[PDB]
Design a protein around this ligand. Sequence first.
Ligand code: CLA
Ligand code: CLA
Ligand code: CLA
Ligand SMILES: CCCCCCCCCCCCCCCC(=O)OC[C@H](COP(=O)(O)OC[C@@H](O)CO)OC(=O)CCCCCCCCCCCCCCC
Ligand SMILES: CC1=C(/C=C/C(C)=C/C=C/C(C)=C\C=C\C=C(C)\C=C\C=C(C)\C=C\C2=C(C)CCCC2(C)C)C(C)(C)CCC1
Ligand code: SF4
Ligand code: SF4
Ligand code: SF4
Lengths: 82, 80, 137, 721, 73, 152, 40, 73, 26
Amino acid sequence: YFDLEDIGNTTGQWDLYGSDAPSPYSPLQSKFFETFAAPFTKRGLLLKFLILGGGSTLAYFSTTASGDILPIVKGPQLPPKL
Amino acid sequence: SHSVKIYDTCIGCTQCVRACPTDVLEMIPWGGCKAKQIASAPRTEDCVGCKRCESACPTDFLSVRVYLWHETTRSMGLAY
Amino acid sequence: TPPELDPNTPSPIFGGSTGGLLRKAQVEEFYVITWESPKEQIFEMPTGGAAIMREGPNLLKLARKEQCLALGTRLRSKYKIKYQFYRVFPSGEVQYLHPKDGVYPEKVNPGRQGVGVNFRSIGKNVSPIEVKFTGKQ
Amino acid sequence: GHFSRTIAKGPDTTTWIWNLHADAHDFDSHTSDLEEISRKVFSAHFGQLSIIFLWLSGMYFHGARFSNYEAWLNDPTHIRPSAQVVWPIVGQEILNGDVGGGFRGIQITSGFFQIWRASGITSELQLYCTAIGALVFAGLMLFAGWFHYHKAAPKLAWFQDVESMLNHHLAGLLGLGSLSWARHQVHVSLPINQFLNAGVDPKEIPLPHEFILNRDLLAQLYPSFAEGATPFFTLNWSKYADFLTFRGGLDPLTGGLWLTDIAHHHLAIAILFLIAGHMYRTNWGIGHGIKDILEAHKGPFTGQGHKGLYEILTTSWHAQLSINLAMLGSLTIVVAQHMYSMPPYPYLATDYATQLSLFTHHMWIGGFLIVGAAAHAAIFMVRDYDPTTRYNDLLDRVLRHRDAIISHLNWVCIFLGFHSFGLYIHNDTMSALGRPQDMFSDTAIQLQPVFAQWIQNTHALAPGTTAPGATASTSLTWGGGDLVAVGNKVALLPIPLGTADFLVHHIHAFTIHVTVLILLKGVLFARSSRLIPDKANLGFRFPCDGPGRGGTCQVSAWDHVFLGLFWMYNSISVVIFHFSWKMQSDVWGSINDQGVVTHITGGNFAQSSITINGWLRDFLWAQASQVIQSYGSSLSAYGLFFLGAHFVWAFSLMFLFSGRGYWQELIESIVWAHNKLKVAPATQPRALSIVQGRAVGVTHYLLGGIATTWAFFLARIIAVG
Amino acid sequence: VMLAFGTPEKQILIEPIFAQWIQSAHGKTSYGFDVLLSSTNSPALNAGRSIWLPGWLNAINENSNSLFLTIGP
Amino acid sequence: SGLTPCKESKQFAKREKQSIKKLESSLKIYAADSAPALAINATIEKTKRRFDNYAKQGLLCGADGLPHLIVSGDQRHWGEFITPGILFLYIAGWIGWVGRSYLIAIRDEKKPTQKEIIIDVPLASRLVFRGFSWPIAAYRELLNGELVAKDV
Amino acid sequence: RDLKTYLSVAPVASTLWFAALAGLLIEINRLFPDALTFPF
Amino acid sequence: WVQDPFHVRPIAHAIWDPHFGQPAVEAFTRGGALGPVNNAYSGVYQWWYTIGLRTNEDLYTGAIFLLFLSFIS
Amino acid sequence: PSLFVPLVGLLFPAVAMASLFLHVEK
Ligand code: CLA
Ligand code: CLA
Ligand code: CLA
Ligand SMILES: CCCCCCCCCCCCCCCC(=O)OC[C@H](COP(=O)(O)OC[C@@H](O)CO)OC(=O)CCCCCCCCCCCCCCC
Ligand SMILES: CC1=C(/C=C/C(C)=C/C=C/C(C)=C\C=C\C=C(C)\C=C\C=C(C)\C=C\C2=C(C)CCCC2(C)C)C(C)(C)CCC1
Ligand code: SF4
Ligand code: SF4
Ligand code: SF4
């Protein structure tokens, strides 16, 4: 009934489902976020920061009192033939 | 895409064409057999490689041979 | 032969399905098929079930090409109906395939060109050979 | 192919022989004449009934001449039920073992002994007659099929009158059948068994017919029978309540349901099926047009609905067969779970060997039939689905959003699989690393099945409150503080539900959902698919459509039944395992003088069935010791069949992991060796077809697998129970 | 079958007499075979000329090592 | 042959006694004169008999106390393999020769496959006994026991 | 009556043949059980 | 291990796993090691001892030499 | 010491899997 070689888009599911909403905005509080979230918006630079943020994992394990790394002590079993 | 070939050992029974669901083959005027026809493979781009054509061939061993080569969406038979 | 071309035609009655086009159509390709019915009949429709055929030009859009032929080969049987389908593309364009020659591929026609015909006969193929090609040229 | 002329034609390859049997019963492929088919299957049912009738005759006959039933009757607690005897040839006689009663025979698990005691049967004389009566019936049934195919075959119009058939089957067969049996109970079963429970001895029991003739003998007990006029015609009915009651629970001396209740049950069931029998329209006005009523239901969601169904279910056998197989199988399953929880036979629950094998047998039969529903449902789509002539609309939409249903069901299985099997892999890992606090256990982070525990709680407090007439509970698994102990064995006991019980139920949720997925996917996409737009033209049983499209192997609806067949095995196989361990661990056992109960495995289910290693050790490795140590004893055959099944099973993997292209090329070399020595058969040897190799594969897999547990279980409970 | 039937004396237990003949041919004095390196007169064992044989023949008749174990049905 | 004959065996002799005692244990609960009685006692005599026979015929018996067969070809133990083996090949050939003789007779004329699925031709004219002398197939070998179509 | 014979001449023939073979073998074993050798 | 090849278990390497519970670290502490280790079943101890390796220092020099051999490859 | 390295043996998969992903989609 409605196929138009002119517009190939409506013909296909090209249309954004009504879930799209191109409406206004949100409060001015954004002016704050835009200021402090800027260094993480660069990409690639952020890729690196997070990977080198893996330096946290090293720091957290080099220093860790309560993970089972001690026997605590025992007298070991010989044991099948010593 | 897939590579299909026809051989002069054909007898022009046209069953390979009727078997194809994508329309990869067709009949051709020729002087080699009594039917004076021969299979042709012009549209290999639409070939999916299912070998339905081979299972209709009556020649002692196939006159039409499908050689599965590079894969494409059409050959992969994808609808998405 | 001159391709007839398709402009606008009504679609057959159906009501919807989940086997229709999806994204591929938008960005790669989609195939449409046209056939004329002497009666508002009922046909199976692949990728779904039950659709009324309609009477008139009848235009349907599908994907994979094969879906169109399946319908077309069922359309030629059961009902004595002629049909034709094309590949739409995403930016207009007019590629018309099948019948093409205007006479069915199974029926021998006068000027087609062989394309990939080997006059050697099978079993007489060679063995490689590190050079380009496989020997079934 | 005897059935078809071209098929019969001539044999050129061995494939002809395999085809001949494969399509022997495929009646709708031999003719397009619906009447001819219907006539064929109707006669086939007679031939079936003859075989099962003959089957029954042999069970009664063997019970008479080759059994120690009489011996078992006087001492049911520690006499082993045994029918059939083995001739002393090539060392066979070892299978004849001590079963008590001074008799040498193989211990049985069919449960006929418990059935016969309930029926009030006392002598081999009585069993002898019933065997002959069955044979006489077998002669009739076989003759009846010959008469209705060659002499007087019904019209298609005859079979199509479904209304008349419905009315009868759920009234003439069900109602009067229940009623007729209800009479035998209170006149024969109840009187005689009442004596048997008083330790009177069978030969000292009067003959059943003496109870019927003179009321005197039957009236001294159950004194409601005393009145000749009977209070029935007075319509007070309160007086009758002595021979029938709503007591429920379990008799503490015989361990079965009170026959005092089953008689009342059938009395109700009978007329309930007699009334419901008067529903559909026939000839004398009063009744329903099922065609009309079906049409009435329609909906904003369904649009036209059910319209046209009556046409479909009156012209397509596969449609009716699928529905029937789906529920007859489902019925067999609920039968298994009702006979274990509510033991209906005298000295049945006490006989642990019979109960395990009864529950397990019904689970497989029920499981198989349901899988068969998938097949014929798919066969209907390929062979009988025609929108032009028989549109439904319900079927439509379903086909319309079929990519939706499967995709969702696909997700649920992944959610279930993770949230079932994953928990076990969690527990297996936390226990191996030495941290049981972490595991999903009753001792650690517990996942209590409070919903199931709540339903059981209300069943316990049901008698008196929401069930005044009920003196006791429905089943003692819902009892609370009750305990029945027949002999030194425990008949039944309240079954607890813990975190270990939460996991296993979620595994059954899983296995069933996946089995549904595989089967349902094959039915909907039986005709068309994005991959194969014309699958319906390839048929229902075809191997493939070539290596094209990346590979289209097992796209057939047949192959979906093939894949779902293994999964139905995987499914039940773990239900029966759940049953076996739970009953042995928390129910079955011996009760002492003080009242202390010791179970067979000693309550190790709760903390050891939460681990995979726990099933592999505390269950398999532990409970196998019987089967693998049965050599030189009466259970010798089970040990062999245990090994024999492991073989036919690994033998299946040969067919399943390979293809026929290899085999055909191998045969070529073998045919050459034959041609050299003039020993080449004119019927050229061919490999099995692609589809047959799958059929051969799954059969042996199921056989070897099923058979292997059979020997597992039957060796376990006999040596222990 | 017979062990199931409780009759292990009906088994087919073929003695690997060919292989046991090889073992005796190596120096094992088990079995009554009288073959090379364990026989009564031959060019083979005396070709030992001490050296390997005395230390090695000690090793073959060791009931502890895996050097030529005892074999059967 | 570290085995010492079943006669001077203490294990194989002990094994006999062990088996019959277990059988005797079973008849104690049935009371003689009864059916399960003979069946047990009949089993016992067969047990004694087979143990008795094995010692007669030789049979070496290992340390385990069970007879071990010797297939080396030793004349002392020919009855353990060679003589039954000769008997097998005889019947094995006989079957082979009769079967081959059948498919050959069928091939000329008729529909050959008809005879294969259905053989309402029994031993043909009289083909079975032809196997009584199969070994004379050695003389069929010097002529045309094999077809010359493929290789030699 | 030609018909019954043929009927008995299909794969059933195999059952009859193997039943006859089994009977022979079993009876042989009755007269000579526990045979581990041919001693004559 | 060298000082008593009969009654000591060779050590492949140490174990370091955060998922290990205390009973795990417990059970795997063997061969006179300060922490949980794996009992070597590759027979490298017998091989290295037989060819003449007696100290840890010797083992290190071999590791360095192989690391160097790995480079020139 | 040995409690610093098995994690970089797990930082490495994070790095490797990320890099390879970029390589294969390019
Ligand atoms: C009384 C003797 C008798 C005779 C001479 C015939 C003769 C015939 N019948 Mg009839 N039939 C009979 C009894 C008889 N029948 C009975 C008692 C029934 C009711 C079940 C039938 C139901 C019947 C049907 C539905 C059909 C025939 C047909 C035929 C014709 C073809 C034969 C055939 O089907 O192929 C094969 C011959 C066989 C004997 C097949 C074997 C089937 C039997 C019942 C197997 C027994 C079950 C077995 C024990 C299962 C366990 C196996 C276990 C060992 C593994 C032929 C004229 C067919 C026809 O008319 O052709 C179009 C046909 O459609 N018969
Ligand atoms: C309600 C009962 C019922 C009825 C009346 C039918 C009827 C039919 N079925 Mg169905 N089926 C059923 C249940 C039923 N089925 C169930 C529960 C399943 C799931 C397992 C199936 C799965 C199924 C498939 C996949 C197919 C059918 C097909 C058919 C049709 C013909 C096939 C045929 O002749 O059999 C042929 C009989 C054989 C080939 C014998 C095979 C050997 C058996 C399986 C071995 C059994 C082992 C034995 C029990 C134990 C070992 C014994 C041994 C060691 C001696 C016929 C209409 C076929 C069809 O195309 O429909 C038209 C088809 O392909 N059925
Ligand atoms: C336990 C499972 C199993 C068994 C028994 C076999 C057996 C065999 N395989 Mg197989 N295979 C298997 C699994 C198995 N395979 C698996 C999982 C794979 C990977 C996919 C393969 C891949 C494979 C390949 C690639 C090949 C084989 C081949 C063979 C044959 C080798 C010939 C031989 O040694 O003895 C002969 C036969 C046997 C030892 C078993 C026969 C079974 C019994 C003994 C027959 C007696 C029947 C008895 C009377 C029962 C009657 C039943 C009754 C209902 C009638 C043999 C039949 C080769 C072959 O075909 O050589 C010719 C070969 O090419 N196999
Ligand atoms: C948190 C605990 C509370 C429980 C609520 C959540 C659990 C139950 C799941 C909600 C499902 C909603 C059912 C609506 C009741 C319902 O089914 O409505 C039925 C509705 C009615 O249609 P009509 O009114 O047309 O029906 C009449 C005619 O159509 C037929 O003649 O039909 C449809 O919804 C069509 C679309 C199917 C809807 C598919 C959803 C299927 C859910 C799958 C889960 C099955 C669970 C079974 C467990 C035993
Ligand atoms: C002496 C002896 C021994 C040895 C043996 C040997 C070592 C040998 C050999 C052998 C050989 C190495 C042989 C060979 C060969 C060959 C050939 C080349 C063949 C052939 C054949 C044929 C040709 C056959 C045919 C036929 C017949 C005649 C019958 C039937 C079948 C047919 C028909 C199949 C031992 C010591 C062990 C034991 C003791 C004794
Ligand atoms: S393989 Fe399939 S698509 Fe290709 S030529 Fe053959 S039938 Fe056509
Ligand atoms: S099937 Fe073979 S012979 Fe027939 S038309 Fe095709 S190529 Fe020619
Ligand atoms: S191997 Fe078999 S199933 Fe797979 S593509 Fe080839 S023919 Fe089809």
